[PDB]
Chains A and B, each alone.
Chain A
Amino acid sequence: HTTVFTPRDFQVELLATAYERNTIICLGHRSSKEFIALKLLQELSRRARRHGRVSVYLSCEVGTSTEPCSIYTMLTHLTDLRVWQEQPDMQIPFDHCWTDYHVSILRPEGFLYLLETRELLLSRVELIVLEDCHDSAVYQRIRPLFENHIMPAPPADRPRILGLAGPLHSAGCELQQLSAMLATLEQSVLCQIESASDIVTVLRYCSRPHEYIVQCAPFEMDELSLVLADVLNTHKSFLLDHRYDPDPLNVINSLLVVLHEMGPWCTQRAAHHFYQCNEKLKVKTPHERHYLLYCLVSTALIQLYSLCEHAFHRHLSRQTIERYSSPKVRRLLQTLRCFKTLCALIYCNQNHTARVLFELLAEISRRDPDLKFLRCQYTTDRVADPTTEPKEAELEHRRQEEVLKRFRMHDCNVLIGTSVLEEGIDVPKCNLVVRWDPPTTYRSYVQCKGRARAAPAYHVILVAPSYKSPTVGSVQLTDRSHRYICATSLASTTKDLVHQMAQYREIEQMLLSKCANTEPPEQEQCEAERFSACLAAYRPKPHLLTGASVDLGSAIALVNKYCARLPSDTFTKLTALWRCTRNERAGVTLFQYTLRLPINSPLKHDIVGLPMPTQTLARRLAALQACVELHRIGELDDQLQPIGKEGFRALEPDWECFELEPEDEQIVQLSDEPRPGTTKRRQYYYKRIASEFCDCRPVAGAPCYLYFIQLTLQCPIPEEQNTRGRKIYPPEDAQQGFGILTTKRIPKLSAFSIFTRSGEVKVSLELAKERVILTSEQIVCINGFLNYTFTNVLRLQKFLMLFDPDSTENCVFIVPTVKAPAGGKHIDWQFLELIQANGNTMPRAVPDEERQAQPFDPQRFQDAVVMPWYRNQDQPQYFYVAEICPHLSPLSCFPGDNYRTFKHYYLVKYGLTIQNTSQPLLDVDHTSARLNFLTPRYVNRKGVALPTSSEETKRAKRENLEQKQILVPELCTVHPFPASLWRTAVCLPCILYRINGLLLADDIRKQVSADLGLGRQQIFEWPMLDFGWRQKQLSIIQATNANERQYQQTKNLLIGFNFKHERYEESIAKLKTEIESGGMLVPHDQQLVVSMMELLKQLLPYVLAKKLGDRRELLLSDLVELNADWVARHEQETYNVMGDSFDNYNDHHAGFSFDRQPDLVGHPGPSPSIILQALTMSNANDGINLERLETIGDSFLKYAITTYLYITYENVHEGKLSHLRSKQVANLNLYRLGRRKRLGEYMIATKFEPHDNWLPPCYYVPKELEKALKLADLLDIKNLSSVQICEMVDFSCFIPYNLVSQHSIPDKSIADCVEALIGAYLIECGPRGALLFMAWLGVRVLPITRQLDGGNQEQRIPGSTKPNAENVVTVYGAWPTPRSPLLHFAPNATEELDQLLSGFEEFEESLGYKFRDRSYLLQAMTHASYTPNRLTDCYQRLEFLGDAVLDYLITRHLYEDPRQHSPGALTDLRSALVNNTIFASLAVRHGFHKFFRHLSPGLNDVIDRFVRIQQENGHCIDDAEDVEVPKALGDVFESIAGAIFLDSNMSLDVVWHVYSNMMSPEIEQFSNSVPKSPIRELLELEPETAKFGKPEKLADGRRVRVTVDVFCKGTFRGIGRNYRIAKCTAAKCALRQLK
């Protein structure tokens, strides 16, 4: 596409010319005729919808059948137009005058009826699409239409008389009167033929091969062919009039043409095929006479093959073809020898000539090694149907698709085809094209010749003696034939066919004569390259002279380098819409251009050119002006290429670079370790304790702070789990509680709750109204007590762990507090004295005397702890007291059998003689050994209650004493702790851990409240921490009706071409002399084969030496200066438009609001419960975790990045905004932002096991043993120094971190925490609060307005950092209101915007939101190939925003459900609910197909099949051809959301309010059931049986087959356009069939 620009698709070329003037589209295929018809009805209906005018499609296949025609489906479904196709004898029901139907399909006599009745006016109609008029009968029917309706009306009132006639070359009749019939047809319907179609736009724009109509020789009949024709004509006579008593002629007659045209060798190899096709088809004879006919044919061909084998295999492979064949194959062999990359495309007539030519070139290419490169594959036609014989049809389809896939890429060059290779099949561009047959008509000739477009191009046509009967008679074998058996007019036909060839050249001259646009010949471009390539090239970087320049030729090669490298899908051909222009200056015809780069491109203006003397020098210079303005505007880089994908550099300062911390940076650069931002790499972080809980040990005299640890039981444990049947003691009623002494005032914290043996108990901390003035000796008192509580009672002290009363970490006090008897609480000093009175007192084994002496006290064993001192002396197990048992005794009945009563049991077990026999017993139980009471013991994470104990085992443990724990009182020692203090002491570690976690979350809140003013600084209490708890036949119609316009058309374009309507000899004689003289007619013996000022004056004839100066060349700025001076001195430059009116005007003329924002001024920020939940990883095994919160944080992050990337970077197309977002939102980036902002040291990744996951208060781990691997030595040495003093004093045994002080956390989990905290800030402080927190990490997604400080700012405008060295703040402003994409390059752009957006009020009444900037709506609708939209851009920039808006809207809808979806459920009620299929079906259902503007054929056909198959279905959601989906319509479904988003001052209530009414019955339907998706659904239903093969390419060239297989269940197939569509439909059909 170098020197000629890129041609448009020919349909919109006819559309443009038909918009320009009246026309007669001479295009063959009916479907694209329907495309262009639909399109002009739509645009001239837009023109018609001003004062009210109709536009007919008068047609001949109407008024007979009650069914609607093929235009009814087209124009009722895929437009907004309403049609009234006239029924057979339409009675016109009621007062229904035709001025309301926009299109009004009739029959021609019906239109005469409407014209004479003055109902349809001939002047008030804006288009008359008469149907096909290349036949006699239709032209005679339309003769009274226009012999009666030209004269009264003027040509001003005459509408466009578009006529969809057939292909002009194979149409009408005869050859001499062809031009006369065309002129009479054009004068008849008041028209002019504009036949510029694919028949024309392959020899005009593309490379023009110079053909060679080569003569072989007269095939002289040697004796071998004489005997062969003798025996074949012997057998002809019987089968001519064969006999039968109570198909063989075609294979005995059309084998002789192989003998006449190819020779005896190809006669043998082509009777091969007939022998197989008849031997296979002789055994199925239901008669017996036809069995004899087929046997005679088969054995004649057997004798034929035997004689041919004995000819050139017994008497003696390039020499065999040279001597024993026709000279036609010698001419073919010489033609292929003339090509020493080749893509040859030999053709044929029938389907057995192709096979014998294949075997000819196969044995030639293999036996003769000279033509080794010829890889031979043949492909015939198809004639069968899947109605009958599917075996042969399938084994032919699976062979044809492999043949055309082999030829498709590069593997085999030649392809000896037949008539299927003309229309349909998409093939690579060719090098040689051979027509072995003389062409049947111009259709075959050009649709075969218009295939070799590379220009080493040769199109050879082999001409030969013609087709006539070569037989002799009905006689038997001759004397010469029997002698051979026993012993062993080019001129006439070539004159006729060069007359046909001059007729073909006259045909192409006629077609090029009827074209609108005219092209300069190759001589003009040759003299352009020779003459005037001496202009100063535009070098962007002129110092280094191997770099970049735009010369004359590089310019025209570059404007079609740039426009084809743009965002575009399959359906769109993006192109530069050139325009030529001539005028006269200084006596010389000067030529302009005008250029228009695509509306997808950001060069939104036309490159108005400069007048050059030829057309092509003007072309090269106008492309040079385009490349100059392109590089100036920024589309071109320093090497004059478009800027790529990754080549976008953001100009904002916070973006780009993204240099890492070196621990992250070297492992990103080298990547030998697992990458950052992933769960695959772990890193260990210090378990950061609260700032209020480090270095806060109270000192003697300074007042400290007393915090009562208050507990209140809320939900007592249900008796279904009360298996032991013990009493339930609420800790509220207990007198002896607990307190914390700490010098720093603890901030307000959320009252969390824990789940212990008494049920759910709520934990708070409160402060006394008076303070504590600590006295002198109490410091060692509480130092002893805390060691006692956390060392001997709860056993929390490890050996790498020792009591350090003057420590840095975990340094607060805990005191035993008592309720006052008169009310209130205070520190129990007497209990402290009791505790300090006894140290590590081993519970002594007492003698018999005192238990003999004193009696049992009932009051001593009320709230007692009763360890047995007769065993386990060093570390006894402590038992509770549930009940006292007066009904039992030491002489009461023993539960067991091996011992007698309790007195006897203790007498013979140990020797403890119980002296008190009247004592009771003690119904006891153990105390808690699993200290973590954070989780409920009887609930799941999903709320499902767990199975409690069976009633049998409950009553067995409660009643039968073989279970249970019963203990004598005088043989147990009461602990100084009561039972109530023991249950509070056991529940202390989880209380302190959750207080610590809430304090870290409050510390994050305070940190972001100090860094950026996001929250209050120092503080009312928080919300509490919790855990949350017939038809199918009709479908066949809609799968064949589209192919209706296929089916008939195929036959309609290969055989008929008939039915004429009612100087040339000189032109044919001139063309014949040119062909015979110019070397085109190959004869059958000839083998195939100035000074600068003068150039300036002839180039710039319209002073010149002033601009030249002393330098060499001239400047383009000087060139526009000469033009400006000449137009200033000489009035006007009135221009004649040489062969566009298509576009003009540039080259011409509160129910859950989603955006709810709290007042961030005076705001407490998020609660530390939600910040804790964001910090809480899912590995915590707690009821709170971050996972459901990261799904809304991530969606808002992606949302806000997308909106900011739209707003800042306003010229760039979104294919690089995706790259900027993928840089910004990626989890590597969110990791390094989190680790920058110290979050990895703030998280929970382990299950809280207080014996192993906790450093108690006033204890200090040395943090030295974990890398190293006496007590006073360990004390003062962990005070001073670690390594040198220590070293002088089941894999990886030198394992990482101790769990007491550090935890391992993977990188993606810190990205998850960042997103989770974005979610927490989102839910609490609004989207703006999440935006400011996103700024606080380092993804700045807001603009900066650095203003001077407010003088100790006080009010503290949030989102404004602490002042720097001077008093200036960096207040983050809101998102900028965007640039409206109304490109004001036309002087009336608001009126042209409303003109091009006519009829969308049905769409806006459908949606409910009336657009205020309707250019957003048009941009959302405008396809990439809607070329007449010189007002806005395409929709891809708005799809890029709309999909992220809808992604966040769906995620925040499913987050708000009371069903409380998981990450998986809320993911998959989105993944199976934001999809191209559901978007396209809601688009089709609400009429988004009816209001989507595009000018693409393939997209229109896909939209046709899908909208019809859906309108059958009521719009519900052999290879199985399921219906292709319009991904463009899903993109329109997203882009309307994006357009409403931007048009609505960036809100999410308007987008969701519009899209709820569409997506809501899918919301409740897919929310109730489980959706899934067909490839995933089949891989889930059958989990690992299902394997998907590699895709294959069909013979059609644009179809893909996938072949899903389920093992031992069936192998299935589906076809489609892409690979995703074909994979989806094949898995969908296997899904439906496997049921």
Chain B
Amino acid sequence: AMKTPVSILQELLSRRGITPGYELVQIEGAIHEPTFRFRVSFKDKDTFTAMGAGRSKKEAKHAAARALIDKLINPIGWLQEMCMQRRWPPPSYETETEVGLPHERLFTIACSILNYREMGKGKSKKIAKRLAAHRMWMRLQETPTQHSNKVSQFHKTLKNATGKKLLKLQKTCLKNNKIDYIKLLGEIATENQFEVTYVDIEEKTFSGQFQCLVQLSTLPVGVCHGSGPTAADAQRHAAQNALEYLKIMTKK
């Protein structure tokens, strides 16, 4: 059935001849889809006539010839609209292949986008482009505060270092100054796997007294403060301040 139904009518009537009378009898000049209605005749003086209808003239003649032989026996933009809604570029389609016979070359149009690729095969390029675009269509329609948490993290980090010394600091009264705070801070820094670094400043203030800033690796890193008439009194004061700092961080 590679030949036209109009040519099928011509071949099945070439046994005697007969020029057929093809007239379009009727037309729906419709609002969105005008349709055509051809009417096929056969001789005008003795003793056949059929209807045919379709959207195009060629398909109308096809339906008319098919009816006479049996008696003898608008999308496309909508998928682009949806890819606009899903915020995509306009699709690009390319031609893949044909058949070496130029009267029966089934064109294949290759529609590739940034997401998927599909093929469209047809006897003409318009039906191939529809088939590729529709395959795109249902393929795309098948698949259309915290710093306080850091502070509490540091709190459970220092609670994880559960040495006796910190709860000893928490429980008893710490008015006593006779304890040597240097070994205390060394043991506490070893307890939470941290380290203490003293920076006694060679620069002096306006009272002539000595001072120091002492650094411990917190999360994020921190320092404490101290001063005294001597540098030894300065590091003792900063040591005591850091010890009571660790005591009150563990105090909860």
Contacts and interface: CB of A to CB of B under 8 A. Distances in A.
A531 interface: no
Interface in A856-894: 871-877
Given A799-B49, A1583-B90, 13 more contacts: A235-B225, A243-B203, A299-B222, A299-B223, A299-B245, A486-B175, A682-B31, A873-B16, A873-B17, A875-B44, A1295-B37, A1298-B26, A1299-B24
B50 to A, nearest CB: 12
A275 interface: yes
20 contacts: A238-B225, A238-B227, A243-B205, A275-B147, A279-B220, A292-B223, A295-B215, A299-B218, A682-B30, A799-B41, A840-B45, A874-B18, A876-B19, A1246-B29, A1252-B24, A1290-B35, A1293-B53, A1296-B29, A1583-B90, A1587-B87
B129 interface: no
Contacts of A486: 173-175
A302 B223 contact: no
B89 A1608 contact: yes
A241 B45 CA distance: 125
B88 interface: yes
B19 A872 contact: yes
Contact of B211 (A243, A482, A1306, A1584): A243
Contacts of A1266: 26
Contact of B248 (A485, A840, A877): A485
B23 interface: yes
A1245 B30 CA distance: 13
B interface SS class: mixed
Interface stretch (A303-311, A374-382, A1569-1577): A303-311
Q: Please give me the 5 A-B residue pairs with the lowest Cβ-Cβ distance, nearest first.
A: A1304-B29, A299-B222, A875-B19, A872-B17, A1290-B53
Contact of B31 (A296, A674, A799): A674
B175 A482 contact: yes
B61 to A, nearest CB: 13
Nearest to A244: B203
Given A238-B227, A874-B17, A1585-B89, A680 B31 contact: yes
A1003 B60 CA distance: 37
B232 interface: no
Interface in A1500-1515: none
Interface residues of A, number: 68
Contact of B206 (A241, A245, A276, A876): A241
B25 interface: yes
B84 A1584 contact: yes
Contacts of A282: 220
A1249 B57 CA distance: 13
A800 interface: yes
Which of A295, A305, A795 lies at the interface centre, i.e. has the most chain B CB atoms within 10 A of its CB? Answer: A295
B88 A295 contact: no
Kindly state the interface size class of chain B when it binds its partner.
35 or more
A310 B90 contact: no
Interface in A243-281: 243-245, 275-276, 279
B70 interface: no
Given A295-B222, A872-B17, A874-B17, A1298 B252 contact: no
Interface in B190-233: 199, 201-203, 205-206, 211, 213, 215, 218, 220-225, 227
Interface of B: 16-19, 21, 23-31, 35, 37, 39, 41, 43-45, 49, 53-54, 63, 80, 83-84, 87-90, 114, 147, 151, 173-175, 199, 201-203, 205-206, 211, 213, 215, 218, 220-225, 227, 237, 244-245, 248-249, 251-252
A243 to B, nearest CB: 4
Contacts of A1086: none
Contact of A296 (B39, B88, B223): B223
Contacts of B84: 1584, 1587
Contacts, number: 142
B17 A1295 contact: no
B25 A1298 contact: yes
Contact of B28 (A299, A485, A1296): A1296
Contacts of A1246: 29
B17 A795 contact: no
Given A275-B147, A872-B17, A299 B224 contact: yes
A724 interface: no
A interface SS class: loop
Contacts of B202: 245
A983 interface: no
A474 to B, nearest CB: 9
B251 to A, nearest CB: 7
Contact of A682 (B19, B29, B88): B29
A1419 interface: no
A245 B26 CA distance: 102
Interface in A667-688: 674, 680-682, 684
A482 B240 CA distance: 12
Nearest to B154: A302
A1252 B24 CA distance: 6
A238 B24 contact: no
Contact of A1295 (B26, B90, B175, B237): B26
A802 to B, nearest CB: 12
Which of A244, A283, A298, A307 lies at the interface centre, i.e. has the most chain B CB atoms within 10 A of its CB? Answer: A298
B53 A296 contact: no
A1278 interface: no
A270 to B, nearest CB: 15
Contacts of A482: 174-175
A292 B215 contact: yes
Nearest to A799: B41
A798 B26 CA distance: 12
A1582 to B, nearest CB: 8
Contacts of B49: 799
B185 to A, nearest CB: 15
A1292 interface: yes
A421 B23 CA distance: 81
B145 to A, nearest CB: 10
A591 B198 CA distance: 87
A1303 interface: yes
A310 B223 CA distance: 22
A1579 to B, nearest CB: 11
Interface string A296-329: 1011001101110010001000000000000000
A307 B24 CA distance: 96
Interface in A821-877: 840, 871-877
A276 B147 contact: yes
A46 B77 CA distance: 63
Contacts of B30: 682
Contacts of B31: 674, 680-682, 1306
Contacts of A243: 201, 203, 205, 211
A330 interface: no
A295 B224 CA distance: 8
Contacts of B147: 275-276, 279
Nearest to B51: A1293
Nearest to B19: A875
Contacts of B54: 1290
A1531 to B, nearest CB: 36
B208 to A, nearest CB: 12
A238 B227 CA distance: 9
Nearest to A1608: B89
A513 B223 CA distance: 62
A1291 interface: yes
Nearest to B45: A840
Nearest to A314: B252
Given A241-B206, A275-B147, A1585-B90, A295 B28 contact: no
Interface string A3-27: 0000000000000000000000000
A239 to B, nearest CB: 9
Contacts of A1607: 87-89
Contacts of B26: 1266, 1295, 1298-1299
Which of B19, B29, B245, B251 lies at the interface centre, i.e. has the most chain A CB atoms within 10 A of its CB? Answer: B29
Contacts of A1296: 28-29
